[PDB]
Design a protein around this ligand. Structure first.
Ligand SMILES: O=c1[nH]nc2ccc(Sc3cccc(Cl)c3)nn12
Length: 343
């Protein structure tokens, strides 16, 4: 219970149902590193499935039932044994209560049953943290898992622009996108259409350079890592299982015969291909989902290097390095051909 809840002082920045959004914070006095983690949890894209989500996933739509505290785990842990990378950092967990992949900028109003304010929640958390010590940071790492990982891609450059415009050009903003790098591929038997509708429902916003490439009606393209990443200017480290369970779910993949074997192998090859020119990346050949906030996140290795090590090497690279790599993508072609994959 080491991160304490703060509801936003600007109570017009809200979760889906109009309750205040917020953040959980564990300060580390003397550390100038700040980790802001975006929670995941899918999304909803119309009145009817947002209503269903409100019935049975209400904590993802409302702060009314949030606990006072949360325990930091994985990269949010303050214990060096659990978090070799950033155990001494200031830790922020931002709950996902906007159901918009962190893209929304619309209030609950006369014509809107729900508010979709994910992009504004991030901005407001940053602005309020500046009064709590973020003004002295030297690195702000915006991290996130699943929908939160896509949220990092959609928001990291906006955080960088926000701090520049507020007068803090010395704070280095970086992104860590975990399990948010998806392919708009052929299904084995769809997201792009749900996101297209969601964006219109949420008044969703995407990074400016990506928006200018794809133009009106095509902003859904910017939710796909391999298309939005080249447009970003902040350093972003990408963590993605080659056989991500959520990717397989949307691909309608649930004794494996030839067609499915080739499908799975091609998925891993395509994912690996999209990471070829991503210099900071960690992509193990495993069937799994998420990594960075799991307590055993230290266990997986690619080519003998763990993710906490790769992230440390990335920090050093931002001050190639002898024995301290940052681009770690498996080349073996089948789930769990890497022996360190989670069980
Ligand atoms: O939170 C979780 N767990 N698994 C998943 C899978 C997709 C998403 S949002 C998303 C991201 C990119 C593209 C699209 Cl079309 C949708 N969120 N998510």
């Amino acid at each position: 219970e080491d991160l304490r809840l703060h509801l936003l002082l600007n109570t017009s920045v809200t979760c889906n149902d109009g309750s205040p959004a917020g953040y959980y914070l564990k300060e580390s006095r003397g550390s100038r590193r700040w980790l802001l983690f975006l929670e995941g949890g899918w999304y909803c894209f119309n009145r009817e499935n947002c209503d269903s989500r409100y019935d049975t996933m209400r904590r993802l739509m409302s702060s009314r039932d949030w606990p006072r505290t949360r325990t930091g785990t994985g990269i949010l842990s303050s214990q060096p044994e659990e978090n070799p990378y950033w155990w001494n950092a200031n830790m922020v967990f931002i709950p996902y209560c906007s159901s918009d992949v962190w893209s929304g900028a619309s209030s609950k109003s006369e014509k809107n049953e729900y508010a979709f304010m994910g992009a504004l929640i991030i901005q407001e958390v940053v602005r309020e943290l500046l009064g709590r010590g973020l003004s002295g940071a030297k690195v702000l790492l915006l991290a996130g898992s699943s929908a939160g990982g896509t949220g990092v891609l959609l928001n990291v450059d906006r955080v960088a622009e926000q701090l520049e415009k507020l007068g803090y050009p010395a704070i280095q903003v970086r992104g860590l996108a975990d399990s948010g790098w998806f392919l708009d591929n052929k299904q084995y038997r769809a997201p792009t259409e749900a996101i297209r509708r969601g964006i219109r429902y949420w008044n969703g916003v995407v990074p400016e350079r990506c928006r200018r490439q794809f133009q009106e009606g095509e902003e859904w393209n910017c939710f796909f890592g391999y298309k939005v990443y080249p447009t970003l200017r902040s350093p972003v480290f990408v963590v993605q299982w080659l056989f991500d369970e959520a990717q397989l779910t949307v691909d309608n993949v649930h004794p494996v015969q030839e067609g499915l074997r080739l499908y799975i192998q091609n998925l891993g090859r395509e994912l690996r291909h999209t990471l070829k020119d991503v210099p900071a990346s960690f992509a193990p050949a495993c069937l799994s989902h998420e990594i960075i906030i799991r307590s055993h996140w230290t266990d997986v290795q690619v080519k003998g290097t763990s993710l906490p090590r790769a992230l440390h090497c990335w920090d050093r690279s931002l001050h190639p390095l002898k024995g301290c790599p940052v681009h770690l993508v498996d080349s073996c072609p089948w789930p769990h051909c890497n022996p360190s994959c989670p069980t």
